[PDB]
Write an enzyme that holds these catalytic residues in place. Structure first.
Site, short mmCIF file in Angstrom:
data_model
loop_
_atom_site.label_atom_id
_atom_site.label_comp_id
_atom_site.label_asym_id
_atom_site.label_seq_id
_atom_site.Cartn_x
_atom_site.Cartn_y
_atom_site.Cartn_z
N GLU A 143 38.94 34.43 40.81
CA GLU A 143 37.46 34.43 40.76
C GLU A 143 36.75 33.38 39.90
O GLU A 143 36.13 33.70 38.90
CB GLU A 143 36.95 35.81 40.37
N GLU A 255 41.25 40.61 46.76
CA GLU A 255 40.70 41.78 46.13
C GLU A 255 39.73 42.49 47.05
O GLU A 255 38.80 41.88 47.60
CB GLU A 255 39.98 41.40 44.84
#
Length: 324
Positions: A143, A255
């Site tokens: 991320e 995710e």
């Protein structure tokens, strides 16, 4: 459809979103190290539910004991390898994910923080461990977000790739993450796709260079709310697949997840269903969160061992486990 897995969290606790890692605050999800039975959790996820892959988050600072570079601290690496071995022992492929948000203590790699060489150094070391083992997947970074220049980031990701193949990890998948928390919804629009499309292996090819995207089902995409509000088909997975398909490339949702509640049980399903339907360009999903989150964790996916008998949580046993 090629992979389905779950994140086994623990070595990433104490990692803030600004790339600072309280390397003391890490908590391995293994018995020994006084944590949950992640090895057990993994045996059950493979044997009973048909899962394939596990994502093993861990921080740069943990790997190196506080140093933005590639000099691996052996004590710490001993603990993290034990997990990778447990996953490999479960008979599954394994994503080694550096959980730093493209930062080291508040400062962006390539762009204020460590250099592309400091980072590449890291990945050479990691890749040199595990080079021959083709079951490993190299998750370059977890991320990235609020990154001002994405071409520069693609560049840093390029150095990592080159470092990795130069350690002789020539068979493995390497995941390449873009901007806005690697949101799938904005992956193409924000510019990340066409910059990371430029990333190539040394021989000039894109073989085994898969994109990394995350996407949650709550209103704001945070994955902090228990109630799911969407399946992301129209606003993320469909557009993305269009782009991926005609560009000859593939992604991998590393995710996703939601609350163990009825709204999620429906939307999560519509989503998994759609991903399988588009298996040519998606390679799989990995559910956020087993390892050692506490029982009530809003996005928890931690099973339960009652004398050798594993109970799953609502969402796994309904939508997320390949069986059914």
């Amino acid at each position: 459809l090629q992979f389905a897995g779950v994140n086994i969290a623990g070595f990433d606790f104490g990692c803030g979103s600004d790339g600072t890692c309280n390397a003391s605050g890490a908590w391995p999800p293994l018995t020994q190290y006084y944590g949950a039975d992640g090895a057990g959790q993994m045996k059950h996820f493979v044997d009973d539910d048909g899962f394939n892959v596990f994502r093993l988050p861990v921080g740069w600072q943990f790997i190196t004991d506080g140093v933005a570079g590639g000099d691996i601290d052996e004590d710490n690496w001993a603990e993290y390898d034990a997990l990778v071995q447990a996953c490999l022992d479960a008979g599954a492929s394994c994503i080694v994910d550096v959980h730093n948000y493209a930062r080291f203590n508040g400062e962006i790699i390539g762009q204020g923080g460590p250099t592309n060489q400091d980072f590449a150094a890291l990945w050479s070391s990691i890749a040199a461990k595990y080079a021959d083992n083709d079951k490993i997947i190299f998750g370059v970074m977890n991320e990235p977000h609020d990154v001002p220049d994405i071409n520069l980031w693609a560049d840093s990701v390029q150095a990592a790739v080159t470092a990795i193949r130069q350690a002789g990890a020539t068979s493995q998948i390497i995941l390449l993450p873009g901007n806005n928390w690697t949101s799938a919804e904005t992956f193409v629009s924000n510019g990340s796709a066409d910059a990371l499309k430029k990333v190539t292996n040394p021989d000039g090819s894109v073989t085994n260079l898969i994109f990394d995207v995350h996407k949650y089902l709550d209103s704001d995409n945070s994955g902090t709310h228990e109630e799911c509000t969407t399946n992301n088909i129209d606003n993320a997975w469909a557009p993305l697949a269009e782009w991926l398909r005609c560009n000859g490339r593939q992604a991998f949702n590393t995710e996703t997840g939601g609350g163990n509640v009825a709204s999620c049980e429906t939307f999560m399903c519509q989503q998994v269903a759609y991903q399988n339907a588009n298996s040519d360009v998606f390679l799989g999903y990995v559910g956020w969160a087993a390892g050692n989150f506490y029982q009530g964790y809003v996005l928890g996916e931690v099973p339960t061992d009652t004398n050798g008998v594993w109970t799953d949580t609502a969402l796994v046993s309904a939508c997320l486990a390949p069986n059914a």
